[PDB]
Amino acid sequence: PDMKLLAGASNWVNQSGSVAQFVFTPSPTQPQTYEVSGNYINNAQGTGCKGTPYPLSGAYYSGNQIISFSVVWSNASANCQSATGWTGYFDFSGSQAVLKTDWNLAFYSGSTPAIQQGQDDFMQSV
Amino acid sequence: MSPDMKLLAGASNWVNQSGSVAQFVFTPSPTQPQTYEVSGNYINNAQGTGCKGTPYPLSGAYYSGNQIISFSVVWSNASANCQSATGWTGYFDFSGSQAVLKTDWNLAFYSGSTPAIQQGQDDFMQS
Numbered sequence: 001p002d003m004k005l006l007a008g009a010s011n012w013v014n015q016s017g018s019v020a021q022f023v024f025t026p027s028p029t030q031p032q033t034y035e036v037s038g039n040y041i042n043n044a045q046g047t048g049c050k051g052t053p054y055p056l057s058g059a060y061y062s063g064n065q066i067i068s069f070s071v072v073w074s075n076a077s078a079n080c081q082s083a084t085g086w087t088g089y090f091d092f093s094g095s096q097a098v099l100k101t102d103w104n105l106a107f108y109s110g111s112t113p114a115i116q117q118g119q120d121d122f123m124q125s126v
Numbered sequence: 127m128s129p130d131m132k133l134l135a136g137a138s139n140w141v142n143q144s145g146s147v148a149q150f151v152f153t154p155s156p157t158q159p160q161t162y163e164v165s166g167n168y169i170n171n172a173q174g175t176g177c178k179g180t181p182y183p184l185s186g187a188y189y190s191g192n193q194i195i196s197f198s199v200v201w202s203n204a205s206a207n208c209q210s211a212t213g214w215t216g217y218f219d220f221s222g223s224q225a226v227l228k229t230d231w232n233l234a235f236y237s238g239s240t241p242a243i244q245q246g247q248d249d250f251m252q253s
């Protein structure tokens with residue numbers, strides 16, 4: 001039901017300590033739909049490309065507060081030659097807003113490609 | 127022209143095992159090296175799903191160093207609205223005889239008041 005989300009640059013911390021900041025811009029073509037921009041700071045132990053902002057991009061559907069966004073792990077600080085996409089939904093029914101996602105992370109190990117699966121639960125950082 | 131270059135050269139059509147079609151457009155990222163913003167349209171043909179047979183915008187990001195991509199569709203247009211969204215992530219495999227885009231996907235949706243996220247996999251080949 002959520003215009004504070006749509007109007008701001010809100011912040012979301014996951015169970016690994018990473019932080020997602022989202023910005024929404026109305027789609028020129030799709031109703032109730034928004035272009036997602038912002039940045040992602042990865043703090044997940046055992047991963048690369050930690051501690052610096054990476055741009056994120058995706059799409060958000062305001063009808064039932066569902067989102068899908070992606071980061072390519074390439075910036076001025078570090079390049080992990082990989083990308084992640086998250087897809088899930090927001091739940092504002094509790095005293096703390098939560099984002100529940102599943103993610104895939106495509107990467108290479110030498111010449112071998114792979115896609116790792118996982119789940120990120122974020123809570124809003126008011 | 128190498129297969130990773132044909133991809134960027136203009137618009138390409140990629141077709142998955144369900145008969146769905148992804149049309150990718152690339153333009154250079156404003157801030158990230160070796161990265162492209164992904165735009166285009168997705169026409170769905172998957173059995174047992176909604177929103178079939180019309181174009182939906184797609185958006186995402188592409189890493190050109192090893193041809194890895196992640197893109198999403200919100201299933202809202204002038205024809206149908208499925209109140210859902212899908213994100214695909216994967217890689218372009220140019221090693222075999224024909225190119226395959228290999229992906230995992232997640233589809234977020236509601237069944238009444240219960241939210242869920244469905245997993246699957248799509249392999250896309252050139253048209």
Ligand SMILES: O=C(O)CCCC[C@@H]1SC[C@@H]2NC(=O)N[C@@H]21
Nearest residue numbers: 018044047048049073080082084
């Ligand atoms: O190691 C890499 O290839 C780049 C960084 C990966 C970070 C992953 S993305 C999914 C999961 N959620 C996080 O916040 N961090 C990890």
Ligand SMILES: O=C(O)CCCC[C@@H]1SC[C@@H]2NC(=O)N[C@@H]21
Nearest residue numbers: 146172175176177201208210212
């Ligand atoms: O039924 C819906 O909620 C909207 C259409 C979903 C189509 C899914 S997205 C993943 C998979 N790949 C396809 O090409 N079609 C299905």
